[PDB]
Amino acid sequence: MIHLYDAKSFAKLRAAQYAAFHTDAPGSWFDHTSGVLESVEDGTPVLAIGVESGDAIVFDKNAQRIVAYKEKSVKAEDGSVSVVQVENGFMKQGHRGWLVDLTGELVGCSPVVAEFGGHRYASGMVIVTGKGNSGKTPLVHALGEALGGKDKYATVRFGEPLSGYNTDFNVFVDDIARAMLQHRVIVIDSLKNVIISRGAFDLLSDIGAMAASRGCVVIASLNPTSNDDKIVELVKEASRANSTSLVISTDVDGEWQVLTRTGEGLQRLTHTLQTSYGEHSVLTIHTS
Amino acid sequence: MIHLYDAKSFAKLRAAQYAAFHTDAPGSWFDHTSGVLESVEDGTPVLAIGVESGDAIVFDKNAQRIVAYKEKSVKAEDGSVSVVQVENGFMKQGHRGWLVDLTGELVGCSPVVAEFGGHRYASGMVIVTGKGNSGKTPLVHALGEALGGKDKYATVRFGEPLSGYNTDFNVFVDDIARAMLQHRVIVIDSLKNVIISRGAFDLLSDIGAMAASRGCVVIASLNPTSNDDKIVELVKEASRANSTSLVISTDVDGEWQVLTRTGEGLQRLTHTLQTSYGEHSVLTIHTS
Amino acid sequence: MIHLYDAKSFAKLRAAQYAAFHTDAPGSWFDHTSGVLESVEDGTPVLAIGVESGDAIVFDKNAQRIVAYKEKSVKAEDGSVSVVQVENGFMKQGHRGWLVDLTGELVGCSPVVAEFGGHRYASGMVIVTGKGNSGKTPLVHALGEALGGKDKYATVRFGEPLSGYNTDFNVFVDDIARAMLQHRVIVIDSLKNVIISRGAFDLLSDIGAMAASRGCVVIASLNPTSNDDKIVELVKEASRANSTSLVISTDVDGEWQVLTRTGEGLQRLTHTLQTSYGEHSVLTIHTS
Amino acid sequence: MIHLYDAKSFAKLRAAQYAAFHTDAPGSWFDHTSGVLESVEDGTPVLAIGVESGDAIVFDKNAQRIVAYKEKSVKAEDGSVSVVQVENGFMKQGHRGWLVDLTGELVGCSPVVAEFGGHRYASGMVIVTGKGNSGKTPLVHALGEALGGKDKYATVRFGEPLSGYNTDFNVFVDDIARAMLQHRVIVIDSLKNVIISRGAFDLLSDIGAMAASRGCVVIASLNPTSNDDKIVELVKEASRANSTSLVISTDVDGEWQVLTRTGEGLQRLTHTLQTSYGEHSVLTIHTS
Amino acid sequence: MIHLYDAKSFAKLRAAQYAAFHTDAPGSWFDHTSGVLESVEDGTPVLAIGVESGDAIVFDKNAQRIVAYKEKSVKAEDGSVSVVQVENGFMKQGHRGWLVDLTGELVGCSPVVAEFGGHRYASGMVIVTGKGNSGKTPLVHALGEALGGKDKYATVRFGEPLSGYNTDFNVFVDDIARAMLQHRVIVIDSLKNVIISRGAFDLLSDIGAMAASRGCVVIASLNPTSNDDKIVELVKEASRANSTSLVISTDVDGEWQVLTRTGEGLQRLTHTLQTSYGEHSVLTIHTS
Amino acid sequence: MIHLYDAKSFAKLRAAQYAAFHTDAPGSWFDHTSGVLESVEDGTPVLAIGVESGDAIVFDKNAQRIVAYKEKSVKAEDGSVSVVQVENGFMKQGHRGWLVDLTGELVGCSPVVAEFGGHRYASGMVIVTGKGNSGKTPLVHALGEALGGKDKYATVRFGEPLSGYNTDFNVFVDDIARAMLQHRVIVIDSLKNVIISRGAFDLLSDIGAMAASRGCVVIASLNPTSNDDKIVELVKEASRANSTSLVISTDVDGEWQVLTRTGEGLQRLTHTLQTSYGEHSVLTIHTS
Ligand SMILES: Nc1ncnc2c1ncn2[C@@H]1O[C@H](COP(=O)(O)OP(=O)(O)O)[C@@H](O)[C@H]1O
Ligand SMILES: Nc1ncnc2c1ncn2[C@@H]1O[C@H](COP(=O)(O)OP(=O)(O)O)[C@@H](O)[C@H]1O
Ligand SMILES: Nc1ncnc2c1ncn2[C@@H]1O[C@H](COP(=O)(O)OP(=O)(O)O)[C@@H](O)[C@H]1O
Ligand SMILES: Nc1ncnc2c1ncn2[C@@H]1O[C@H](COP(=O)(O)OP(=O)(O)O)[C@@H](O)[C@H]1O
Ligand SMILES: Nc1ncnc2c1ncn2[C@@H]1O[C@H](COP(=O)(O)OP(=O)(O)O)[C@@H](O)[C@H]1O
Ligand SMILES: Nc1ncnc2c1ncn2[C@@H]1O[C@H](COP(=O)(O)OP(=O)(O)O)[C@@H](O)[C@H]1O
Fold this sequence. Notes:
The structure is a homohexamer.
Chain A: E1 3-5, H1 7-22, H2 28-38, E2 47-50, E3 56-59, E4 65-66, E5 69-75, E6 81-87, E7 90-93, E8 97-98, E9 112-116, E10 119-122, E11 124-129, H3 136-148, E12 153-157, H4 169-182, E13 185-189, H5 198-214, E14 217-221, H6 231-241, E15 245-249, E16 255-261, E17 268-277, E18 283-285
Parallel strand pairs in A: 11-14, 11-15, 12-13, 13-14
Antiparallel strand pairs in A: 2-3, 2-8, 3-4, 5-6, 6-7, 9-10, 15-16, 16-17, 17-18
Helix pairs in contact in A: 4-5
The structure holds adenosine-5'-diphosphate (6 copies).
One adenosine-5'-diphosphate sits between chains F (133-138, 190, 221, 223, 277, 281) and E (265-268).
C-alpha cells in the first residue's frame, strides 16, 4: 500500500528498519511470516509468480498450485482494493508477489536471516557473481550451509548441462515459489538461463522483494558468460541493483567481498570472506 | 483543449503563469483542485492512467476504481467533445490523464507546491538522480517531509529488493493514482523498474503533467543502473526533459542542485541544497 | 492524383508555384480553402489523421469526428477513384490527409501564410529546433503572434510536464485536426513525445503537406532530448526533410536562422531573426 | 518462368537483349506491351502491387482496381501454373508484378525508352540521388520532359511537406500502378517516405522489373536524409542495386553522372549531363 | 534418418563419399535420383519448400503442386516415422526438403555433377560472389553452359530491375523446386533479394542439401550489395558455410577461384578459372 | 525437485558426484537409465523436446511420438506435483526434458560415458569448436568411434549443404530424441543452423542436461560461421557455458584441447588430443 509519514513517524520507521537488521534475533522475521502464512484461510492464494510467457501461477500456503479461484476482493487500510481470481491454472485478476500482507507498516527492511562468523546477513536476494569462469557453485553451497546453521538449506537447480538439472523455466519458478514458501535459506544454481523472457525479467524484478518480505534468503550464482573483460562491471551493476546483497569474487584466491543493503535508505555494509577447499571441492568459509 | 491568443491575451497568460509559481500562496492550487474534484458528480471518472499493457484504468474522486460506466460526452469551450466509457474495468473511450478539467484557460503552469528554506518548489514531477548508487532515498524522504510541511507526505514504494515493496507495475499505477488524488506531497522510491513497457513509457510521459495539473508534487528517485559513466548525462537529459524539476547529486558530499522549470516558457531556476545524516540515516536539509 | 506535363505546362506550373509564395496576397490561399471547406455538403468527411495505433479518425468541416459514413466513391480527371467509408469511428476506406480537393490543379506550393519584418513566410510545417534545451517555446509563441498578425494564433499543447498539458497522442491529433480546420496560424508545444508510434510517424510524414494544402502554418518546437552533440545535426536533418520551413538556434544570443522551402523544386531562402525578452519571458522578434 | 539454354540459344538471347537497348527504335517496347495489354480479356487482372501492409492490390488493363475475381489458373510453357484470385479488394491468390506475360522469351532487357542528346536511355527504374540537400527535383522533371520527347510525362507526388502531396503509401502505389499502366515516362517525387513497411520494401524490390517489363521509365528522386557524409555511399549502393539506371550528383555545379545497365550481363554505360537553371528554377539539360 | 557406425563401417562410408565425387561417372547420381523419382507412386509428394511466410508448398515427381493429400506415414529402417499431409495447398504434416528417400545410407556426399576443363564439379549449391558489383552474371551463365555439357541448363531469374524478372519470393521457390525436379544444371540470377524472410532463410539453409541429394548443381550469383569493404569477407564466410562450392572474384581481370567441398569431412579443393568476353558480353571459361 | 542439505548430506552428495565421474564403471550410468526406461509402463511419456516454434513434442521409450495422452499427475517427495498431458501431438501440460526419474536423488553429475587413451570422458554435451572452418567433422567422428568403444555411435546430420542432410529443425529434434533414447554415444554434425528460433534456444539450453541425465554423450561440431576473429572467443564462451565438455582447436596441427566439467562444483580437467589423417580423411586419435 501507500504509507503516510511526518518527521516523527518517519524516524520511528527508520529505527524499526534498523532494528530489523541489527538487533532482531536472526531468523525471527522468517518465523513471524511463517505464522502469518499458517493463519491464512484454507485454499487462499498467498503467492503469484510469473511463468515464462508473463502470465502468473498462484500458490497456497502449503505450496500447492491453485488452478481455480473465484474472484475475491480485499480492502487495505490504504483504501486500495486487491482482487484475486484464478482460472484454468493462471492468475486472471491479481498481482505478482505476495497476495497476503506479510509486512504491514514494517516495510523497507532487510530482515536479518542469519549470523555467521561475526557478521549478520540479510534476507532477500544475494547474487554471487564477478569475474571468473568458476568458483561460484561451491561458494553458494558453503553460504547456504552456513546461513542455514541449525537448519538444512534448500537447493533449486536450473539450467546447467549436468545430470538431473531442470532446464524448463516454468518448473524453475515452481521450485522457487515452493522454496520461499517453506525454507529460510535457499540456493539457486544458477541464474545463467535466467539472464530474455517476460517471466525471467519478472523474476529478477520480483525475487528480492519476495524473499525480503518472507525473511528468507535466496543465494543465486551468476557467471558472466561474457569475457573476464568489463561486461563484468555491467553484470555487477545489474546484479547490485536487483539484489539485497552482492557477493563478488576478487583479485585474491578464495576471497570474496560481501556488500549488504541493510534496509531502505540505510547504511550499506561490506566485509570479506576467506575460503578454502577440502575433498571433492567442498568449500569452507573461514571465521576464526 | 486548444487556446487562441493575441499579444495582449498572451501577455496576460504569461503573467498568470509567472504568478502561479512566484506569488500564489504555496499549496493553494492543490486546494483549488481538491475543490474542483469534490464538486464532481458522484460516480464521474476523474483520472485515467495506463497499466503495463497500455490499456488504462479509471478512478473516481475518492480514488476508487470505476469498473463500468456508460458512454458520456461533454462539450468544451473549444467546441471539442470529450467522451468517457468504462467497460470490464478498462477505459473503452477517453484519454489518459485527468478526465475532468482542473485548469481551464490556466495552463502551462508549475503551481507552487510549498516553500522551504527560502525557496519555492514547483508541483509536477521532481526526479532525484545523478551519479552514485546511493543517497537518493534519504533525499527524497527529506524533501517529502520538508515540502509536506504541516502535512504528511505519501510514499509509493516500487521495484526494490526490500521487504514489502510491490514489484507489479499495475499496482504501482494504482498507488500513484490514489496518491495524486489524495495528497499534495508524494514520494516514489523508485523509478528503477519503470525506465520498457507501454505503461511505463506512458507513466514518464504523463505523471509530471498530471501532478502539475493537480498542484501536487511527485518526488521520484532514479539511480543510473547503468554505469557512473555518461550514461549519467543521458539519464540527466532524459529526466530533465520529462520532469518539472530536477535534483542532481554533485562532487561535494551532501550537496544537491535543484533545477526548477517555473512554467511554460519561463525562467529555469537553480539553487543548491546542503544536507547531513543523523541517526538511522535520516537526512536533514539545511535551511536558514 | 497523377499530373501530366510537357515543357510548356511545366513552365506554367513553376510560374504558378512561384507566384503562390512570392506574389499572392499573404493568407489568400487559406481564405480560399476556408471557402472550399465551408461549401462542403453537410456531413462530408474532409480530413483523416492517424491515431496512435496507425488507424485513422475522420473529421467533418466543423472538426467533429465522423463515427459512421456509408461508402462514397469519387472519380477524378485522372480516371482514379477515391473512396471514403467510416465505421465505428474509424476510416474503413480512404487515405490520410484531406478528403476533399482544396486547391485544384495547383500542387507543390508553399503558399504564403503571412508577411512580417520584410519577409514572407510559408504555410506548411515549421520546425523550430537546434542546440540547447531552452528558448524554443518563447520563439514559437512570438512567431505565432507575428504571423497571426490581425488574427489570433491557436496553441496546441502536448507532452510536457506542466499544468493542463494533454499527454495522450489521440487527443493531440484531435487538437491538430481542429486547429488546421479552423486557424491559419498554429503553434505546437511540443514534438518531444511525438519523436515511435505508427500515429506519430504518420504525423511527421503528413502534417507539412496537410498544412501547406490548407495554407495554414504549423509552428512546432522540438528540443534535441539527446545531447548538444552531433545528435543535433541528425535532428536538424530529419526536421528539414519533413518540414516546409526550418528555424534553428545559433551561436549568437537571441538569434535564429529561418530556412524556407518556397515550393516544389524552387529556391530555398534564408534570413535571420533577432529577438529579446521583456517581462515574464515574453519574446519579441525585432523588425525595424 | 524458367528458361533453358545451350550455347546457341544463349548467344541468341544476348544478341536480342543487346538489340533491345542499342538498335530497337526508342519506345518500341512500350508500344509492344501496350498492344499486349489491350489484347487482355475484359476484367482480367494484369498487375498486382503491394500496399503498406504487404497485401497486394490488383488492377486491370485500364488501371481500374479489381475487388472481386474468381480463382483462375493458367499454364505457362514452363509447366508452371499461375493462379489469380481477388477477394474483398485484395489478392488472395497470385503474385506481385505483372499478372500477364509481357516479355515471353525476351527477358533480361533494359528496353530503350528514349534517346536524348546523343544518348539512349533505358526503361526501368532510374534513381536520381547523391550528395546534397537540393537539386534532385528539378533534374527529375527535366529528365521527364526530355525522355517524354513528343509525349507528356506523368508525375507521381509523394511524401513531401508541400501543397497537394499525397502522404499515404496506399495512394502512392495506386498512382504508380496507374502511371506504369498508362504512360511511358513517369517521375516520382520522392522516395523519401519510401526508404520500412512491407509494401515499401516490396516497391523497391519490384518497381524496376515492372517498369523494364512494360518498357516505361520511372525516374525517382532520393535525398540522403542523412549527412553529406558517407551514408551517401550506402544510399548509392542500395539505389544502384535496385535500379536499372543511376543518376548521381557530382563535385561540379550542375553536373550529373548517368550509369546505365543496358541488360542482363551486358555492358554498363556512363555519361555525364550538364545542366542550368532558367526562371522559376526550371532546369535545362544541355545537349549541343 | 540417423545412422550407426563403427570404425569399419565408417571407413566404408568415407570411401563411398570419396568415390561419389572423385570416381563416379559425372552426372550419374542425377540419373540415379531421376530413376528413384520416376518410380514413386502416382500422386506421392516428393519435395517440400518454404514459401515467404515459412509455410511449405509441396510438389509431385512431375513438378506439379500438390494441393490436397490425406495423411500417409512411412516406416524407415531407423524406426523413425515420416508423415506427409497437404491441405489447402500447404503442408500440414511433414518436413521441408525431399519427401522421398533419394540417398539411403549414402549421405554426406557432393556427387560429381560434371567434369569440365580437367576439373570435376560438385552437385549442391555453388555461390558465385566476391568484390565487385559486376561480372557474376556472365560467369554463372558460362558455368551453366559448361557444366550442362550435352544438356541445356535451366535459368531461374529473380529480383533484379530488368525485364521479365519475377520479384515475388513465392514464385522464386516454385521456379527452384521445378528446376531441381527436372534439370541437372540450374542457374539462379540472383540471390540479392533472398539474403530477411522466414522463407528466404529456409532457402539458404535448405537448397545446397536438396541439390546435393538430387545430384543437380545450383549456380547462384550474389553481389555484395553492401560495400566493397569487408563486408565482402562476411559475405564470403556466410556463402562458403552455406554452399557446397564457392566461386570468388580476384584482383586479376577475368580470374576466379573455385573452392569445392568434396564431401562430408573430406578435402576442400581449389582451382582457378580464367575467362574472357566475346560479343554481347558472352563469357568463355578457358580450358585446355 | 528441490533438495535439502546440511553439511553432512552435502559432503555425501559431493562424494557421490565425484564417484559418478572418477570411479563408476564407464557407461554404467547409461546402462542404469536404459533399465529404468525399459521398465517404464507401456505408453508412458519419457522425453519432451522443443520443436522450432517453442512447443514441445513428446516421445515414449521406443522414440515414437505420443499424439494423445490424458492428464496424469505424479507426487514427488518434495510435495511438488509433476503433470503430463499430450493433445494433438503436442505437450499440453508438463516440462521439457525427461518425464520420468532416471537417477533418483543423485543430481549434478557428469557420469562417465567412456574411457579412452588414459582419460575418462563425461556424458552430457560436448561441443567441438574453435578457430578455423575445417577439421571439426573428422574429429567428432573419431571421438564418436573412440568413445563408442565396443558399441557403434549414432550420427545425427543437420543443416549442411551435402547429400542426405536434413535441414528441417523439427526432424532434427526427432533425430536427437531417438539418439538419446537409444544410444550412449551420439555425434551431431552440425550446430551451424541451430546457433535464433525458440526451439533452437531450447535445444542449446536443454541437451547437455538431458544427455547427462541419461548418461549418453552428444558430440556436436560448431564452426564459427563468423570470422577467425575474437568472435571465436564469444563462441567458445557461449559453448563452454552450455556444454559439459569443450573440445577446441589449437595453434598446433592436429592438436585439440579437451576441457571437462567433472560435475557440479567439481574440478574442471584439461587434456590434449593428438590426431592424424589416414585415407579418405579418416582421423585417428593417438593414444600410446
Ligand atoms: N579443489 C579445487 N581446487 C581449485 N579449484 C577447484 C577445486 N574444485 C573445483 N574447483 C573449481 O571450482 C569450480 C566449481 O564451480 P562450477 O560450478 O564448476 O563453476 P561456477 O561455480 O562458476 O558455476 C570449477 O570450475 C573448478 O575449476
Ligand atoms: N549514515 C550514513 N552516512 C553516509 N552514507 C549513508 C548513511 N546512511 C546511508 N548512507 C548511504 O545512502 C544510501 C541510502 O539510499 P539507497 O536507497 O541505499 O540508495 P539510493 O538512495 O541511491 O536509491 C546507501 O546507499 C548508503 O550508502
Ligand atoms: N528572461 C529570460 N532570460 C533568459 N532566458 C530565459 C528567460 N526566460 C526564459 N528563459 C529561458 O527560455 C526557456 C523557455 O523555453 P522552455 O519551454 O523552458 O524550453 P524550450 O523553449 O527549449 O522548450 C527556459 O528554459 C529558460 O531557461
Ligand atoms: N535558380 C536556382 N539557383 C540555384 N539553386 C536553385 C535554384 N532554384 C532552386 N535551387 C535549389 O534546388 C532545389 C530544388 O529542389 P528541391 O525539391 O528543393 O530539393 P531536391 O531536388 O533535392 O528534392 C532547392 O533546394 C534549391 O535550393
Ligand atoms: N564486354 C565486356 N567487357 C568487360 N566487362 C563487361 C563486358 N560486358 C559486361 N561487363 C560487365 O559485367 C557485368 C555483367 O554482370 P551484371 O549482372 O551487370 O553484374 P553481376 O554479374 O555482378 O550481377 C556488368 O556489370 C559489366 O560491367
Ligand atoms: N587429408 C587431409 N589433410 C588435411 N586436411 C584435410 C584432409 N581431409 C580433410 N581435411 C580438411 O578437414 C575438413 C573436414 O571437415 P569439414 O566438415 O569439411 O569442416 P568442419 O570439420 O570444420 O565442419 C575439410 O574442410 C578439409 O579442408
